[PDB]
Amino acid sequence: MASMERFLSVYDEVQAFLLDQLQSKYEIDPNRARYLRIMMDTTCLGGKYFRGMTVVNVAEGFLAVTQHDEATKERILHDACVGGWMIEFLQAHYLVEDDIMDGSVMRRGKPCWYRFPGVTTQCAINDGIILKSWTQIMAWHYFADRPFLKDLLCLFQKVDYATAVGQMYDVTSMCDSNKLDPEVAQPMTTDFAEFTPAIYKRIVKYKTTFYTYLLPLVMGLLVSEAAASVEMNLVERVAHLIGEYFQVQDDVMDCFTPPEQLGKVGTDIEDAKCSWLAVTFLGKANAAQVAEFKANYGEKDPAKVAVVKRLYSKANLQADFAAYEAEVVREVESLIEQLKVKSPTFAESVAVVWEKTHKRK
Amino acid sequence: MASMERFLSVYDEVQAFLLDQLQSKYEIDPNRARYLRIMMDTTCLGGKYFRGMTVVNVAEGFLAVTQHDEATKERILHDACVGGWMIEFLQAHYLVEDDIMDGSVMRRGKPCWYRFPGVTTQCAINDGIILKSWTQIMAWHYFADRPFLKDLLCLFQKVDYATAVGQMYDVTSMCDSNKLDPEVAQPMTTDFAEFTPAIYKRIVKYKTTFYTYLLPLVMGLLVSEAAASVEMNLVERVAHLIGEYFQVQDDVMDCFTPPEQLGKVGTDIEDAKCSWLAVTFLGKANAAQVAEFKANYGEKDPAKVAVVKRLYSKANLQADFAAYEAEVVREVESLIEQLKVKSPTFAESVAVVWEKTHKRK
Numbered sequence: 046m047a048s049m050e051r052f053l054s055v056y057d058e059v060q061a062f063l064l065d066q067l068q069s070k071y072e073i074d075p076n077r078a079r080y081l082r083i084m085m086d087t088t089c090l091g092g093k094y095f096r097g098m099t100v101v102n103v104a105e106g107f108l109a110v111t112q113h114d115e116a117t118k119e120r121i122l123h124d125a126c127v128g129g130w131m132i133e134f135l136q137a138h139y140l141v142e143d144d145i146m147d148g149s150v151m152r153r154g155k156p157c158w159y160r161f162p163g164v165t166t167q168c169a170i171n172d173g174i175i176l177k178s179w180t181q182i183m184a185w186h187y188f189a190d191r192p193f194l195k196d197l198l199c200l201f202q203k204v205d206y207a208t209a210v211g212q213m214y215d216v217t218s219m220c221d222s223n224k225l226d227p228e229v230a231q232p233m234t235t236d237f238a239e240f241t242p243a244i245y246k247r248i249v250k251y252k253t254t255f256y257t258y259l260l261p262l263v264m265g266l267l268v269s270e271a272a273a274s275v276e277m278n279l280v281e282r283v284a285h286l287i288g289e290y291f292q293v294q295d296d297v298m299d300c301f302t303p304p305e306q307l308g309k310v311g312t313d314i315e316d317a318k319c320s321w322l323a324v325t326f327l328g329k330a331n332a333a334q335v336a337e338f339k340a341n342y343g344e345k346d347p348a349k350v351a352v353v354k355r356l357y358s359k360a361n362l363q364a365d366f367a368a369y370e371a372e373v374v375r376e377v378e379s380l381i382e383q384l385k386v387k388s389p390t391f392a393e394s395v396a397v398v399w400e401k402t403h404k405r406k
Numbered sequence: 407m408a409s410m411e412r413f414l415s416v417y418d419e420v421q422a423f424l425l426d427q428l429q430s431k432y433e434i435d436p437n438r439a440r441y442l443r444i445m446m447d448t449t450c451l452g453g454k455y456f457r458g459m460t461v462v463n464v465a466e467g468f469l470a471v472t473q474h475d476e477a478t479k480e481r482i483l484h485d486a487c488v489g490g491w492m493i494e495f496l497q498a499h500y501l502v503e504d505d506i507m508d509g510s511v512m513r514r515g516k517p518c519w520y521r522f523p524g525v526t527t528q529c530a531i532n533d534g535i536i537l538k539s540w541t542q543i544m545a546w547h548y549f550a551d552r553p554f555l556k557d558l559l560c561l562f563q564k565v566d567y568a569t570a571v572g573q574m575y576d577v578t579s580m581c582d583s584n585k586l587d588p589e590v591a592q593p594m595t596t597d598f599a600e601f602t603p604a605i606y607k608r609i610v611k612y613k614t615t616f617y618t619y620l621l622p623l624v625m626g627l628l629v630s631e632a633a634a635s636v637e638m639n640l641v642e643r644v645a646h647l648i649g650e651y652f653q654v655q656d657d658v659m660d661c662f663t664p665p666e667q668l669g670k671v672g673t674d675i676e677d678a679k680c681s682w683l684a685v686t687f688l689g690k691a692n693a694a695q696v697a698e699f700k701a702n703y704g705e706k707d708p709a710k711v712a713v714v715k716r717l718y719s720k721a722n723l724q725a726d727f728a729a730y731e732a733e734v735v736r737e738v739e740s741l742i743e744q745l746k747v748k749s750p751t752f753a754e755s756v757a758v759v760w761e762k763t764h765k766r767k
Contacts, residue, residue, distance in 0.1 A: 225441050
């Protein structure tokens with residue numbers, strides 16, 4: 046079967062396993078099982094599955110050049126699909142909780158989960174907790190007998206933690222660090238001195254690149270029993286580089302992509318986020334432009350938001366993005382060439398991951 | 407050293423390890439490290455530590471009757487303390503998130519963490535996520551070389567999941583199950599048909615007894631390498647029985663203990679909770695009393711709350727609690743006697759756990 050068709054078929058298996066176990070072992074009633082089935086579908090389905098499919102594609106790459114019985118090929122592909130769904134459910138956890146934390150309105154053209162009438166924040170926070178718990182149930186059940194169980198659970202934990210630390214970096218990025226204090230309401234920065242490329246890169250590395258690129262690539266290696274055959278330092282470097290580019294694209298779209306295509310109204314300017322646009326603007330602005338940015342950034346007022354978008358457009362940030370992109374292309378191609386020394390098959394899988402990232406909306 | 411003094415000394419070690427690792431590996435700055443140190447202290451410290459100390463006390467029981475080098479005794483006690491803090495941090499996670507979900511105001515005589523001025527819900531949800539992530543960092547770091555690492559992580563996962571499922575049961579306990587639907591705002595039950603002893607027992611079993619009694623008892627066995635020497639079915643039965651009694655006490659206190667001693671204003675009546683008081687009242691009320699309960703339960707109106715408390719007091723629920731308590735005493739003593747067949751030392755540790763539970767405020 047097609048890779049995507051296999052991946053979706055495994056979702057139905059995993060869902061049935063989880064819901065059946067709730068019935069047979071957790072005394073759940075049919076109505077609460079239905080609620081959790083709808084929660085799972087609403088929070089986990091409807092994206093592109095590019096993180097989960099990366100696991101599948103990495104595993105497929107090794108299958109083509111490794112001797113295995115057919116039953117083993119089937120096992121490895123099934124494991125890759127389960128591992129991919131672990132990552133999709135982890136993402137679902139962070140989207141549910143982040144939408145609540147940020148007071149977001151829409152996601153993927155539908156209301157955020159907590160805004161469903163029969164959900165509310167009281168249930169949704171716990172639903173997000175359940176989503177991540179399900180990732181561990183998946184691993185312990187499907188990978189019980191597997192040699193990679195330990196390495197996989199350890200990796201998953203370290204990526205989850207990095208991601209939570211990254212979320213802290215992200216939601217506090219508009220405060221001055223020396224003013225951060227649980228006892229004192231956090232004021233927005235006035236000098237924007239911490240809107241720098243290095244600080245931006247730190248925020249992005251932790252908040253998205255570990256779970257969006259490092260985890261799928263390494264999980265693909267683990268379920269293929271192929272990790273020792275690659276230079277892990279290169280995998281890390283290329284995952285963090287591609288992941289940063291992915292987030293830069295997302296930052297630009299938040300500001301300039303029509304809500305109909307974005308699936309939501311972007312509010313990064315109102316929210317005073319340390320976006321690639323803001324950092325890059327401050328890296329080329331003159332004094333008057335900096336002063337105007339400061340007078341308008343981080344406020345809900347639509348007229349102030351429009352002033353910021355006008356500053357961005359007059360600053361020709363398309364040129365900086367093209368320069369950024371060209372440099373990422375250079376560096377990603379270089380890392381792919383290095384991966385070929387030990388792992389020509391894995392290097393090609395990374396080249397496919399990059400092409401998919403580069404060529405996306 | 408005293409058991410409690412050892413336990414508290416290990417907190418300072420674990421905290422230093424976690425914060426140092428954030429600095430050396432996660433690029434954290436001193437101000438965000440300070441924020442997380444204060445978060446850890448505020449959310450994890452200040453209780454009685456009875457869950458974490460159960461691990462220590464179970465381990466101490468086996469040390470007294472098992473041959474070990476001194477360095478091994480020290481290792482086992484240190485492991486018991488780390489394991490106990492895993493449970494305390496897990497509880498801290500659920501209290502942070504539950505206080506947000508429930509819109510709680512106070513906890514332990516201080517504002518709930520999310521209500522600190524420099525925290526807010528946007529940070530607090532993620533802080534609670536970090537708290538549980540720290541439990542896994544603890545285990546993978548301190549128990550890296552240990553034979554019980556796998557069993558311990560597996561147990562912890564299954565207890566965490568059970569607890570999240572229990573929270574779902576708890577916060578939906580005032581809905582009619584057949585009306586539960588993400589698309590429809592959930593109305594409060596009018597017939598209270600699901601306020602039964604069996605349904606109450608299910609809610610309580612999952613929402614608190616796994617992490618409050620099962621996890622500390624079994625973790626004590628695991629770090630002592632003593633689990634195979636007990637009948638696990640009895641451990642489960644006694645953990646769920648003592649844990650239910652613990653929660654019944656908490657339900658009664660929510661209604662009748664002065665806020666100054668409770669550390670908060672209890673709102674179970676306003677929140678329409680399936681409390682032991684409500685279930686037991688409905689198990690002895692006449693028709694007129696049931697009708698009055700229905701007309702007043704689950705509403706913020708202080709006059710309606712006072713009507714419910716008056717119905718409870720006129721129903722002489724002290725007599726039902728004394729009868730409940732007497733029956734728990736019978737059953738707990740019976741299970742302790744059964745535990746003596748294989749595990750006289752562990753049975754005594756359970757007897758101490760029970761005495762502490764029974765004799766508490």
